[PDB]
């Protein structure tokens, strides 16, 4: 009852949960990952010198509090213009902020105000960061999309500068945090990345607060084929070390026939809980029925998943 | 008791004298020009099909009541992209909307309230409108931003398409009006092509107010070559006819060498005021110092022409 909630995640797996989270008596600070750089916000990483705005305008989207057609512009996707079709103007509108200040999370601030958001929202940097990612035949990938694409096994994932650094801020809410949930989002291209900052881990471990590991309803392909529970919980032990998650939430229920069919159209497979090696790897087990179809796809269901983590 | 006041202008002129009017006790209601081709705003006319929304852009920064730091983000433009270079976030931000609503008068309705504008201020046209000059020699130019760019001399300048439609919310304000305002603005590519919208230049001769007509201080290049303020009052009559301007304003004391040299560079020389010319059309003429060197570049003083206007 009126907890302080820490969450490192990414992609549509992060909004979907965020929109659900506030509602509840939480406080949040959402740590969003600077890395990718595919689509709107990769070219504008690259031609602008920014880190990518794609994710946070995300988040920021899923924490506003506006009308409706204040949320449709700020997601408003350009068709035509060659140049600028394909950009966001969220992103665009990020971007110009920037700019003016010259500081990404300076300018997330102040978007956020705009957007009247509960709670805070910070970059996992203030500059971008490059994501690389060691094969298990020994071949490096570098860039964040590029790693799926290489069609390769995962064997470990890296952060580039390695003088990055997260901020004042970030590492002061993981103290304060009551909570920190780590996912829910890709394991290897959104929430390695993130926990992955310098400083990071070490800081996660030394909280006292309670660490929720939201892991992967389906795998993916290039990234976690054939991954279990255990494996998506194993590869963050790996990365970041022990005592980095107290308790793992997973849909334990079956999947929809034609849900599961979807998917498999593209490399994709339901996630296997193996509840004894989980139990192995010294965490707890969070298991219910925790999402729910839309249009064949899959999302979390932030109530039921809020309700979960906060006890 | 609030004077309702409409004003026919175009471009930085329109938005200088806008950001002092609306300080008085006064109801504004600028209505826009929405044919010009030049720039950002040609570009997205072009790709995205929807009418130029820079000259808006500025009236509605103008009349705009935000934090510095939101206007500036308003009035951003990208320097780098080269697909996204040139273009101001505020034109795209207006273009986004125009999308979303399929109505450009509506999408800028919509950003009147995000910048809690004090006022009202609508488009000539809800759809684009094509410039166009008939050359003394007879020639064509298409284009608003062509035509001074042929070096030749303006005869009569008039719009494509012919059906193109005001918005009722335009005839109306021109009917409630107490004043109505021509200019600030280039004659032939600002203030023209706004009174030339069919219904105009009617509806105006039967409004009973006050107006008007803030002339040129400086000639243009390929536009107003010699002219002078007769020559402006001149061509707005002999497109629009008589009954369209009571008075005219014109700055009667002299421009420093300084101002007139950086001008001369642009083939730009003052407008000499012919007390006589401006009598024989039947207009009254109201001289005073209504500019003010800004870093050598001449605006207006829009209290001084404010307070004119407001008799």
Redesign the interface.
């Given at each position: 009852k009126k907890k302080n909630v820490v969450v490192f995640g990414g992609g549509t797996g992060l909004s979907v949960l965020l929109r659900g989270l506030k509602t509840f008596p939480v406080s949040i600070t959402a740590i969003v990952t600077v890395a990718d750089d595919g689509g709107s916000s990769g070219?504008?990483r690259k031609?602008?010198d920014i880190p990518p705005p794609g994710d946070v305008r995300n988040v920021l989207v899923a924490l506003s509090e506006v009308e409706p057609?204040?949320e449709?512009?700020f997601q408003?996707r350009?068709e035509?213009?060659?140049?600028?079709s394909g950009?966001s103007?969220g992103n665009?509108?990020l971007?110009?902020?920037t700019?003016?200040t010259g500081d990404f999370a300076r300018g997330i601030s102040?978007m956020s105000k705009?957007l009247n958001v509960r709670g805070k929202v910070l970059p996992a940097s203030n500059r971008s960061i490059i994501l690389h990612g060691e094969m298990e035949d020994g071949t490096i990938v570098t860039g964040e999309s590029s790693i799926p694409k290489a069609g390769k096994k995962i064997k470990r994932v890296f952060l580039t500068p390695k003088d990055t650094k997260p901020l004042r801020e970030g590492l002061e809410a993981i103290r304060k945090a009551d909570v920190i949930v780590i996912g829910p989002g890709s394991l290897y291209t959104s929430v390695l990345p993130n926990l992955l900052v310098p400083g990071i881990c070490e800081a996660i471990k030394q909280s006292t607060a309670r660490k929720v590991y939201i892991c992967n309803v389906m795998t993916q392909n290039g990234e976690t084929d054939g991954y279990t529970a255990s494996d998506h919980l194993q590869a963050i032990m790996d990365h970041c070390g022990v005592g980095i998650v107290d308790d793992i939430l997973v849909h334990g229920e079956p999947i929809s026939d034609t849900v599961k069919a979807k998917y498999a159209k593209e490399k994709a497979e339901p996630v296997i809980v193996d509840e004894h090696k989980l139990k192995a790897l010294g965490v707890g087990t969070i298991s219910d029925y925790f999402v729910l179809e839309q249009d064949d796809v899959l999302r979390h269901n932030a109530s039921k998943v809020s309700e979960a983590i906060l006890e």
């Open positions: 070219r504008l031609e602008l057609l204040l449709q512009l408003h350009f035509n213009g060659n140049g600028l950009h103007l665009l509108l971007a110009g902020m700019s003016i102040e705009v």
